[PDB]
Ligand binder design. Structure first.
Ligand SMILES: *C(=O)[C@@H](N)CCCC[NH3+]
Ligand SMILES: [K+]
Ligand SMILES: [Mg+2]
Ligand SMILES: [Mg+2]
Ligand SMILES: [Mg+2]
Ligand SMILES: [Mg+2]
Ligand SMILES: [Mg+2]
Ligand SMILES: [Mg+2]
Ligand SMILES: [Mg+2]
Ligand SMILES: [Mg+2]
Ligand SMILES: [Mg+2]
Ligand SMILES: [Mg+2]
Ligand SMILES: [Mg+2]
Ligand SMILES: [Mg+2]
Ligand SMILES: [Mg+2]
Ligand SMILES: [Mg+2]
Ligand SMILES: [Mg+2]
Ligand SMILES: [Mg+2]
Ligand SMILES: [Mg+2]
Ligand SMILES: [Mg+2]
Ligand SMILES: [Mg+2]
Ligand SMILES: [Mg+2]
Ligand SMILES: [Mg+2]
Ligand SMILES: [Mg+2]
Ligand SMILES: [Mg+2]
Ligand SMILES: [Mg+2]
Ligand SMILES: [Mg+2]
Ligand SMILES: [Mg+2]
Ligand SMILES: [Mg+2]
Ligand SMILES: [Mg+2]
Ligand SMILES: [Mg+2]
Ligand SMILES: [Mg+2]
Ligand SMILES: [Mg+2]
Ligand SMILES: [Mg+2]
Ligand SMILES: [Mg+2]
Ligand SMILES: [Mg+2]
Ligand SMILES: [Mg+2]
Ligand SMILES: [Mg+2]
Ligand SMILES: [Mg+2]
Ligand SMILES: [Mg+2]
Ligand SMILES: [Mg+2]
Ligand SMILES: [Mg+2]
Ligand SMILES: [Mg+2]
Ligand SMILES: [Mg+2]
Ligand SMILES: [Mg+2]
Ligand SMILES: [Mg+2]
Ligand SMILES: [Mg+2]
Ligand SMILES: [Mg+2]
Ligand SMILES: [Mg+2]
Ligand SMILES: [Mg+2]
Ligand SMILES: [Mg+2]
Ligand SMILES: [Mg+2]
Ligand SMILES: [Mg+2]
Ligand SMILES: [Mg+2]
Ligand SMILES: [Mg+2]
Ligand SMILES: [Mg+2]
Ligand SMILES: [Mg+2]
Ligand SMILES: [Mg+2]
Ligand SMILES: [Mg+2]
Ligand SMILES: [Mg+2]
Ligand SMILES: [Mg+2]
Ligand SMILES: [Mg+2]
Ligand SMILES: [Mg+2]
Ligand SMILES: [Mg+2]
Ligand SMILES: [Mg+2]
Ligand SMILES: [Mg+2]
Ligand SMILES: [Mg+2]
Ligand SMILES: [Mg+2]
Ligand SMILES: [Mg+2]
Ligand SMILES: [Mg+2]
Ligand SMILES: [Mg+2]
Ligand SMILES: [Mg+2]
Ligand SMILES: [Mg+2]
Ligand SMILES: [Mg+2]
Ligand SMILES: [Mg+2]
Ligand SMILES: [Mg+2]
Ligand SMILES: [Mg+2]
Ligand SMILES: [Mg+2]
Ligand SMILES: [Mg+2]
Ligand SMILES: [Mg+2]
Ligand SMILES: [Mg+2]
Ligand SMILES: [Mg+2]
Ligand SMILES: [Mg+2]
Ligand SMILES: [Mg+2]
Ligand SMILES: [Mg+2]
Ligand SMILES: [Mg+2]
Ligand SMILES: [Mg+2]
Ligand SMILES: [Mg+2]
Ligand SMILES: [Mg+2]
Ligand SMILES: [Mg+2]
Ligand SMILES: [Mg+2]
Ligand SMILES: [Mg+2]
Ligand SMILES: [Mg+2]
Ligand SMILES: [Mg+2]
Ligand SMILES: [Mg+2]
Ligand SMILES: [Mg+2]
Ligand SMILES: [Mg+2]
Ligand SMILES: [Mg+2]
Lengths: 88, 136
RNA sequence: CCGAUAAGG
RNA sequence: GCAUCUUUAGCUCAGUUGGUAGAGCAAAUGACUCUUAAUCAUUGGGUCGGGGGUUCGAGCCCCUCAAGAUGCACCA
RNA sequence: GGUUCCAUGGUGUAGUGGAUAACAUAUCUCCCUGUCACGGAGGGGUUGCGGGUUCGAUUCCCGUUGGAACCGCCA
RNA sequence: CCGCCCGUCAAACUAGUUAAGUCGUAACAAGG
RNA sequence: UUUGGUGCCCAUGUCGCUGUGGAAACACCUGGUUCCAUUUCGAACCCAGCAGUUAAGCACAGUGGAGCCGAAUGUAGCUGUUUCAGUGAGAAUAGGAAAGCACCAAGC
RNA sequence: CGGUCGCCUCCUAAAAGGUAACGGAGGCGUACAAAGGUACCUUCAGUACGGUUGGAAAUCGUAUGUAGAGUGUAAUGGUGUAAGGGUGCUUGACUGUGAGACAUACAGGUCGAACAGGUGAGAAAUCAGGUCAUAGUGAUCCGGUGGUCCAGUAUGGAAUGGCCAUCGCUCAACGGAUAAAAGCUACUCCGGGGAUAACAGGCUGAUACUGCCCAAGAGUUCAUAUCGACGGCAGUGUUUGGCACCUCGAUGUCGACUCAUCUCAUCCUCGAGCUGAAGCAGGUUCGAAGGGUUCGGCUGUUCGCCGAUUAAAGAGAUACGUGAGUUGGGUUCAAACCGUCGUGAGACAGGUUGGUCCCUAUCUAUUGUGCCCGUAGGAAGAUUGAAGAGUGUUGCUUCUAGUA
RNA sequence: AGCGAAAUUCCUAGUCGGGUAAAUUCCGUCCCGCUUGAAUGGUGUAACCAUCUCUUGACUGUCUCGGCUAUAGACUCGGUG
RNA sequence: GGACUGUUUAACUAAAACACAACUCUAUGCCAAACCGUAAGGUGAUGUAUAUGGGGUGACACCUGCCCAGUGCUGGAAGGU
RNA sequence: AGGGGUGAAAUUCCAAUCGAAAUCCGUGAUAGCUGGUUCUCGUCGAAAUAGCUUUAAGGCUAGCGUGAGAUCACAAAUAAGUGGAGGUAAAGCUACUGAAUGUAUGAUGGCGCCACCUAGGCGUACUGAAUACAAUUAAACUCUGAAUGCCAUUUAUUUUAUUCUCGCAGUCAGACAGUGGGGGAUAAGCUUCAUUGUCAAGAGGGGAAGAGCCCAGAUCAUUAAAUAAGGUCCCCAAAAUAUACUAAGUGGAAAAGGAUGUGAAAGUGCUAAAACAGCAAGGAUGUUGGCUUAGAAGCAGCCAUCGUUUAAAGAGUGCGUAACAGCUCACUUGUCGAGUGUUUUUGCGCCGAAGAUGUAACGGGGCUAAGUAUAUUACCGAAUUUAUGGAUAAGAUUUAUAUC
């Protein structure tokens, strides 16, 4: 005897968006490359770093990326692109 | 039968009883206590049996505290049912007892009755119990 | 249209 | 078998989900009438089936018995 | 064991696409009659429990009871 | 005639018998 | 060095309590006739002037009250190999703490 | 059969990203000419006090309060001078593009510096290629609409196409077979599968059965003579179950008959402890598997109820033992009818009548009986007995003694 | 209307009576007939059936319970195989 | 249970199944309806509604109740498509 | 006369065949499904994964293999150091959201008793807001918070490829073991994921026997040597010393629970001013207190749980008596002259422990060591390594066809 079985009601899931950090600290970067994909600003933008229509951080100039912790109780993260600054 | 009045989620993942003792490790309300030596899942039915045992073997002025509480529920699929078609329905509530958690404590009656009372409470529970006293 | 009227005296 | 329910004044049943019980009939009492019926008021009448346990407190919650009834096997 | 429907006054049933609940019987008061039935006038009485959404739930959503209607097969 | 009276249903005893049960009003007046 | 302005910082920078201060400046303040303004109010914003003013704000000294920060030891978890060597939290505690770093204008 | 089929959010997801299950919770197939863009101004909800209507809670004033407020929405993340609220002017909810990246099998998706044209806000710097962000969507083919600096089948047109923009699919089974499509087969057939079920085996032991631990109580009083709650720990594989490892180039599946064998958790017989054991007859526990453990009525039955006996009418295992030993009553072929379902062919662990059970034994196992050879010269007799096999049940009457 | 636990009844081995020492089958009756029922006909019906079902007399090896005898095999010898 | 005598699955089902005499409904006016073929031709029938074809029930006796909403069949004025 | 015939109807019969004859032809129908596919050697050598699929036993692309070419460093690996992202393990709940324990102050109601018909008041068997103290719980809680892992860079070393292009594939059924989880019941040799390994496609040695466990990676020959896991009484190659423990064949399978088994340790009480046990004596009075109970009065429930004498004595220690009573003990003293009593932490053992063919829960014989723990020096043990020789591939010196 099988006795019959009930039915499940929740078996739905969405595609996983590949968010997170893309360029790590110290890595050289050119303008227009993505540094951080997020839903809502988890990492604030600094100098030479822009914002998009999806809160995506992209570079604005050549240089080395660099994360600096700031904000109350050092709970806010900020990214920047320190220009090559070779300066001979 | 101790039972939470409401829960946000009917069917939670079971909580492991393997490990040392997180909280409820030292007698802090009474001065004699029933410590556990083997982590296990014990349900509200065993608590009520043990609590009723303590109360029947207590006196007219003894006072007791129950530390553990059956927060987590557990489910059980109905009999003769093949695997699939979702999780079963919640059946009984169990308190998670780890190795070293003081379950029951007693005070305000002589030592022999308290030792005897904790013994009858621990014979009602699956865990391997042990008597401990409160630090001065 | 128009039905009924408790028991023994 | 098993799981489930029921046992509540003389009878048929609500009790409420813990501060210890009423409803409708039956009985009686009056009132009422020549007297009754009927009516009307009023009214006494309980081991909450028996024990154990919880609780400060059990008709009320949990067990074991006693008597019946239910739903699941007189092996698909 | 699973699935669909229902729970509205004292009894039988409608409605409401959120802002509002009626019909009949029954009940009460008064005409009516020697009296009563029938008759006439007027009066009155309503969303199973919970929990969310909304400014607002009988209505919308998810659970919990009770009553039904369907199925539970092939070896 | 606010008289009389019939037949189902319900209860008991042995179709009958039963003080005050229920649904009608068939017959006795031109009984409508 | 002190006052005033401002950037960096984002409580060991706060909230509060007790006192002192103004020379220059900062401020309240004096009026709405001008530019400008109120979803209505010269309250605010904006004007043109410093009569009064140290309540405020502001600036200094004290205040361990609230808030914040938090050592060492030990412990829980981890990595290996052991059934012991590193890694080392959270909580708790002694305790610190009445901000700090630069630039500019004035008497110094 | 029921449920689901595309996209978005959280957890499982093990602190990069990714990661499944008929795992646990929810939503979407939009909304806004302002909820867009810009300039300026401005900052919670709640609570405390004080005040007509006015009430616990409408609005006002002051203070407190560090987000529990708002951010159209399901969640997550973000954001309290912000991305929240108000006002003025506007339409960048632009045209042609696009270096470089994210993520990806492809198709598609996401971010974007910067350039040219012409605008909006603003004194200017600057910002504006839709919204705080992630769901709000469908390929190709076919045909229709608007524009057009292209073609126009000898030439001029036209018809008909081309390019760009746009319209028609809960094509939702949502990478979409065709513009267009439901059922029965027990009258069946073919190719395969132990990739996958029904019988049995295997693993598990939820459930089932047996046992034990604590002692509340019941028991003329007394937990433990006999029971034993509320609880807990085991054993067996012994019911109902779970998995799908062996078998679909076939492992014959219920019951009955014949023959039985094994285990002990012992029904009788045998021995003993305790007793709420006077005697007789009992109750419970311990030891013990040598033997025995009946015949019938109804049902295919196992089971079960009933009748009469017995010392007793035990519980199980052995492919729920046993069809190359028997039977075929039952299940389950084709035939036929009843009830019910279906419009129907047909279907029902609903009911009933009828209905093909093959094999000469090669190996091994076993029951009997022989030949050869060995036992060291040969033969004829009589023995011991290592290792074994067979049987083992029990009742009634009398006496003891109507004695204890 | 008729019939009704039926070739139909799940619960159900329905209640009661009869048949037996004892009766899930049989006969009569009762009726909440889940889901009987009137030309896919309803209810009775003398005769008939290699039809189904139940009780019974005689009868018998069906059985308690097995035993004996005779043939053809099986078994031994010769031939085919 | 079938009224009966009969017929049936050659080679697993002989029956309650089929048939049967009987009842009823329906179509058919003769170049009849129905049927074989593509048609000729033919069966019906060298028959004529007391006749033929098809559907259902199945001796004999007593009965056959209500519903024309849906479907099927027949007829119908006009009207709409 | 066959998408036809016949059928008193069963899917009947139509040449031993009928859900639609037999035979030939289209035809070598089609089959994502079974089965089979034939000589040798050498080099290298997978996958059982993702997405889509009327797709799930199939197919395409990506991932993994192989052949050729390019890239020398900026490419890719192995170690050390540094920087960064994160929110898991843990921990915490006065840092939120839920759940939640006790104490104290207590809104609130229930419950009363009054007054008053509406404004209310005094206590609440009790419910319980908020606050303080102490303590808790969480995958979808976080004021915090690692390690590992991930990305990038620096240094050292190594390889021309794990990078790019082209040709040819196979693979889309996986299994088990350790670790972190989901479903299941903290069941499954269960199912679904992440990661480390083995098998698949891998022999050898250990595990008695075993695909997945441990040691490792087989070119061929050698009757050479050293070793890994594992082991050294015999089967079966190889051991001895020394120190303790076990008495159970424990070893050589098990839980809750129970026990004067034994060894070690750390404390505490008395003792030759006499210890403990036993023996010999006493072991009391009011009184038999009093309610209470038929009665209790040393031993029913009570009112409690008395006091003196005295060495000691209890409203008694039980038995027991209707109850007293009575026997008798807790307590004190004496013969007595060497050990006793208790607490805690540990090592090895006992019981709990019943299944079905035959010892059958060490592999067997056997073992009080041939069992357990420790220390020292040895040995055995693989197809591992070394040594001798034969064969062969690719790289170098170099061209004898020589050495690495
Ligand atoms: C049919 O119902 C079988 N599955 C039940 C067998 C029960 C045996 N105790
Ligand atoms: K098979
Ligand atoms: Mg996601
Ligand atoms: Mg009078
Ligand atoms: Mg069937
Ligand atoms: Mg001042
Ligand atoms: Mg379906
Ligand atoms: Mg992650
Ligand atoms: Mg990770
Ligand atoms: Mg939201
Ligand atoms: Mg605006
Ligand atoms: Mg906006
Ligand atoms: Mg088309
Ligand atoms: Mg032309
Ligand atoms: Mg699809
Ligand atoms: Mg897609
Ligand atoms: Mg086949
Ligand atoms: Mg299989
Ligand atoms: Mg099976
Ligand atoms: Mg078990
Ligand atoms: Mg006793
Ligand atoms: Mg087992
Ligand atoms: Mg059994
Ligand atoms: Mg599998
Ligand atoms: Mg097998
Ligand atoms: Mg075979
Ligand atoms: Mg065979
Ligand atoms: Mg066979
Ligand atoms: Mg025994
Ligand atoms: Mg013997
Ligand atoms: Mg008989
Ligand atoms: Mg079995
Ligand atoms: Mg069998
Ligand atoms: Mg058997
Ligand atoms: Mg079975
Ligand atoms: Mg056999
Ligand atoms: Mg057989
Ligand atoms: Mg045979
Ligand atoms: Mg056989
Ligand atoms: Mg048969
Ligand atoms: Mg037969
Ligand atoms: Mg048939
Ligand atoms: Mg029908
Ligand atoms: Mg022998
Ligand atoms: Mg009837
Ligand atoms: Mg009748
Ligand atoms: Mg019958
Ligand atoms: Mg009978
Ligand atoms: Mg029969
Ligand atoms: Mg009958
Ligand atoms: Mg019928
Ligand atoms: Mg009919
Ligand atoms: Mg009949
Ligand atoms: Mg016949
Ligand atoms: Mg012969
Ligand atoms: Mg011969
Ligand atoms: Mg016949
Ligand atoms: Mg015949
Ligand atoms: Mg035949
Ligand atoms: Mg025959
Ligand atoms: Mg013609
Ligand atoms: Mg003719
Ligand atoms: Mg017929
Ligand atoms: Mg008939
Ligand atoms: Mg009719
Ligand atoms: Mg009509
Ligand atoms: Mg018509
Ligand atoms: Mg065809
Ligand atoms: Mg047929
Ligand atoms: Mg033939
Ligand atoms: Mg072929
Ligand atoms: Mg095909
Ligand atoms: Mg190789
Ligand atoms: Mg692999
Ligand atoms: Mg993989
Ligand atoms: Mg396929
Ligand atoms: Mg490929
Ligand atoms: Mg945790
Ligand atoms: Mg909390
Ligand atoms: Mg896998
Ligand atoms: Mg798999
Ligand atoms: Mg695993
Ligand atoms: Mg798990
Ligand atoms: Mg798992
Ligand atoms: Mg597996
Ligand atoms: Mg393979
Ligand atoms: Mg191997
Ligand atoms: Mg081996
Ligand atoms: Mg090699
Ligand atoms: Mg050696
Ligand atoms: Mg070694
Ligand atoms: Mg040797
Ligand atoms: Mg052993
Ligand atoms: Mg001991
Ligand atoms: Mg010891
Ligand atoms: Mg073992
Ligand atoms: Mg060797
Ligand atoms: Mg080698």
């Amino acid at each position: 005897s099988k006795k019959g079985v009930g039915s499940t009601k929740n078996g739905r899931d969405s595609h996983a968006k590949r968010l997170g950090a893309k360029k790590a600290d110290g890595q050289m970067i050119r303008t227009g490359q993505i540094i951080y994909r997020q839903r809502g600003t988890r990492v604030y933008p600094g100098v030479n770093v822009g914002l998009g229509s999806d809160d995506t951080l992209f570079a604005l100039s050549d240089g080395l990326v660099k994360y600096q912790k700031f904000g109350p109780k050092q709970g806010k993260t900020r990214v920047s692109v320190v220009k090559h600054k070779l300066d001979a | 039968m101790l039972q939470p009045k409401r829960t946000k989620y009917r069917k939670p993942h079971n909580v492991s009883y393997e490990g040392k003792a997180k909280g409820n490790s030292y007698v802090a309300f009474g001065e004699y206590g029933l410590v556990a030596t083997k982590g296990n899942w014990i349900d509200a039915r065993a608590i009520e049996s043990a609590r009723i045992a303590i109360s029947k073997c207590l006196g007219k002025t003894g006072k007791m505290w129950i530390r553990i509480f059956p927060h987590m529920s557990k489910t059980k699929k109905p009999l003769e049912v093949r695997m699939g078609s979702g999780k079963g329905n919640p059946e009984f509530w169990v308190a998670v007892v780890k190795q070293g958690t003081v379950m029951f404590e007693v005070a305000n009656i002589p030592e022999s009755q308290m030792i005897k009372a904790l013994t009858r409470a621990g014979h009602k529970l699956p865990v391997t119990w042990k008597i401990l006293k409160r630090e001065e």
